[PDB]
């Protein structure tokens, strides 16, 4: 774990970045990375949501001890998983996710890059990105463990949270190690 780390304790917690309403980015390609440690089999780690009314979203999660991303940019849900690396072991891990239109990459540590190429024509724009929620409380799957080095499309979100950025709201059982 390097630099700004946050610990998430029993009962849960949350870190929310709201984009100023006049400046919600729409993207054709995305890039998400984070460092984590957890013993949990189930949690939502990070979730980027489009404004109310729109279905587009991107969600980094753990399911059956395996890290993956599920996103939607207008066609269907597309899922990508590292379905071999056990990552719920209390040890530090890095996950890197890439999206390009309907296509996506994922890798964990130095394991081979997983690629996903969904079949049929695909929408490509993630519209009107409104909130980055870190912690999984809202999704009903709170994360417990540590997070560091969050990067989303250039935004080093956790540092921003460390430096009291106006748009960040920190709630619940979350501590700035």
């Amino acid at each position: 774990h390097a630099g700004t780390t946050y610990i998430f304790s029993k009962g849960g917690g949350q870190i929310t970045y709201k984009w100023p309403p006049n400046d919600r980015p729409s993207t054709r390609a995305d890039r998400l990375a984070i460092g984590f440690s957890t013993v949990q089999k189930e949690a939502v780690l990070v979730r980027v949501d489009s404004s109310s009314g729109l279905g587009d979203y991107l969600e980094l999660h753990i399911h059956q001890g395996k890290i993956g991303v599920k996103f939607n940019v207008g066609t269907d849900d597309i899922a990508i998983e590292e379905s071999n690396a056990i990552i719920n072991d209390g040890k530090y891990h890095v996950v890197r996710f890439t999206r390009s239109g309907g296509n996506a990459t994922l890798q964990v540590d130095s394991w081979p890059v997983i690629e996903r190429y969904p079949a049929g024509r695909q929408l490509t724009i993630f519209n009107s990105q409104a909130t980055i929620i870190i912690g999984g409380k809202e999704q009903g799957q709170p994360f417990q463990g540590q997070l560091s080095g969050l990067y989303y499309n250039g935004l080093k979100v956790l540092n921003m949270a460390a430096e009291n950025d106006a748009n960040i709201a920190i709630v619940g059982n979350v501590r700035l190690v």
Binding site: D23, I125, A130
Partner: protein
């Protein structure tokens, strides 16, 4: 100080310091791409050559080729000031050259300034950025204003509908200009992270198309789309091969192979090409933007319905009576239109825009009903207004609102206006309301100086002040994404409340601009087919 020099990434240029509001530095005839001549006719533009020493950019370069001829001209599509004043206008295009990719920079003397880039154009066939002087807007708004020249007509938009000539060269030119600006505006004290593109008419259509192209990514953040959209009958050419063939056959390039056909066209003298008459179906274009699958990747309707565009701050609008020309020839001595002329006029409209047999007896009767003032159905002057309204609604308002709704729906900050003012002049009959192009003088501060040869308006104190209001809104938007903010309140537009600014002597926020008429065109008329 008087002839200031700026070192661009291609070498130093020398401009003029011009007084009018502080003085403005003018750099005219700056080259932004290599001449699209020879092998590079019907190809994408290429970057310009660099030079040593100082290059004078102190007068307008040669303009792009165009042949202005009543009867070749697309009258219904050109703004009133253009068609009203075409002698003193041919004056601005009398010096042509295929080598014409030049832009002009207006820099106010006064960190890093916003940049407004204007895309001129009436019909894609004509014009030059040079007839708009950006000095007043620049100096009043403390923003850099750039005007451009891009390839026009055949040279700018010829396409075969296959790989031989993919088209959109003029749009590619606008992109190349924006690339130049991104890399070089800093040297003039511009901020590449605050580039607003804007335009009126066919220029507005370009601006809308550019918001749908992956090529635009990073080159600008805001757009102002005045009196045009990507969705009108005349915004896009869905039948380029047909018109290219007519041209080829006229100039003796009859080969059937499209690759050989283009090479033959490529070696022809351009003057021979522009002298031809290729007349398009009424209200459509022979040469213009096409759906090539790369630059414009699909029908704009589909792209916008589906949300396939990035998040630009957008301002758009329309003028009260854009469609003045629709009543050419049928207005009598008393400024009225007869019932027979009303019928004929709606009948011909149906034939030109809804030429499906049958279902058109129905459509014609419905349109007549919709555009009759049932509370004053005998008044010939009202008949006239409604006819101008029919065409204005159909060609401008309905698609503007369609466009506004779709940007707003996908979360891009949207601002809508209805422009209800225009200058007193002889360019236009006294009964007419604000016509196509009438906003231009206000956006560019012309009243602050006086009448010009193109806008021979008799301006009043009110005109000066309305111009001040418009430029403040426009440049505020350039600065912050919000026309109310430099660092009367114009509410944001979303498709729920649909608030818009009524721009006139007394500006005011209102809602659902002509919603019933827009519904009629967008909702009812499609069903019924």
């Amino acid at each position: 100080a008087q002839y200031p020099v700026v070192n661009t990434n291609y070498g130093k240029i020398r401009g003029l310091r011009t007084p009018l509001l502080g003085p403005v530095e003018q750099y005219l005839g700056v080259p932004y791409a290599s001449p699209p001549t020879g092998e590079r006719r019907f190809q994408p533009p290429e970057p310009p050559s660099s030079w040593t020493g100082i290059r004078n950019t102190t007068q307008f370069a040669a303009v792009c080729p165009q042949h202005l001829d009543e009867r070749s001209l697309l009258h219904d599509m050109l703004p009133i000031w253009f068609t009203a004043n075409l002698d003193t206008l041919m004056t601005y295009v009398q010096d042509q050259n295929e080598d014409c990719l030049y832009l002009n920079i207006y820099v106010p003397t006064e960190s890093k300034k916003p940049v407004m880039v204007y895309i001129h154009g009436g019909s894609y066939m004509e014009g030059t950025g040079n007839m708009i002087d950006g000095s007043i807007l620049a100096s009043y708004g403390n923003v850099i204003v750039i005007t451009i020249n891009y390839r026009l007509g055949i040279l700018g938009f010829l396409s075969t509908g296959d790989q031989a000539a993919k088209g959109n060269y003029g749009l590619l030119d606008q992109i190349q200009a924006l690339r130049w600006i991104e890399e070089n505006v800093g040297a003039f004290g511009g901020d590449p992270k605050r580039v607003t593109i804007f335009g009126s008419g066919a220029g507005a259509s370009c601006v809308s198309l550019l918001t749908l192209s992956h090529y635009s990514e990073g080159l600008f953040q805001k757009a102002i789309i005045q009196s045009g959209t990507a969705l009108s009958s005349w915004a896009v050419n869905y039948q380029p091969a047909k018109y290219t063939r007519i041209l080829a056959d006229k100039v003796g390039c009859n080969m059937l192979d499209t690759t050989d056909m283009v090479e033959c066209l490529r070696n022809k003298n351009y003057k021979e090409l522009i002298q031809q008459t290729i007349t398009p179906a009424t209200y459509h274009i022979a040469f213009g933007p096409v759906i090539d699958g790369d630059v414009i990747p699909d029908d704009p309707q589909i792209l916008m319905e589906q949300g396939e565009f990035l998040n630009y701050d957008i301002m758009l609008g329309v003028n009260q009576g854009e469609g003045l020309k629709f009543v050419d020839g049928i207005v009598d001595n008393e400024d009225g239109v007869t019932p027979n002329d009303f019928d004929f006029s709606v009948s011909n409209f149906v034939d030109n825009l809804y030429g499906y047999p049958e279902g058109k007896d129905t459509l014609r009767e419905t349109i007549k009903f919709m555009y009759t003032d049932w509370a004053d159905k005998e008044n010939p002057e009202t008949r006239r207004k409604t006819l101008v309204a029919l065409f204005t609604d159909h060609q401008w308002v309905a698609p503007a609102v369609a466009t506004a709704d779709l940007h707003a729906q996908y979360g891009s900050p949207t601002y809508f206006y209805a422009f209800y003012h225009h200058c007193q002049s002889e360019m236009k009959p006294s009964w007419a309301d604000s016509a196509h192009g009438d906003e231009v003088p206000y956006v560019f501060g012309i009243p602050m100086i006086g009448p010009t040869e193109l806008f021979s308006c008799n301006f009043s104190k009110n005109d000066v002040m309305l111009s001040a209001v418009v430029m403040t809104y426009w440049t505020n938007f350039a600065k912050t994404g919000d026309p109310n903010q430099p660092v009367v309140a114009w509410s944001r537009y979303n498709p729920k409340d649909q608030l818009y600014l009524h721009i006139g002597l007394k500006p005011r926020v209102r809602d659902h601009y002509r919603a019933t008429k827009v519904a009629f065109w967008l909702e009812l008329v499609p069903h019924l087919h």
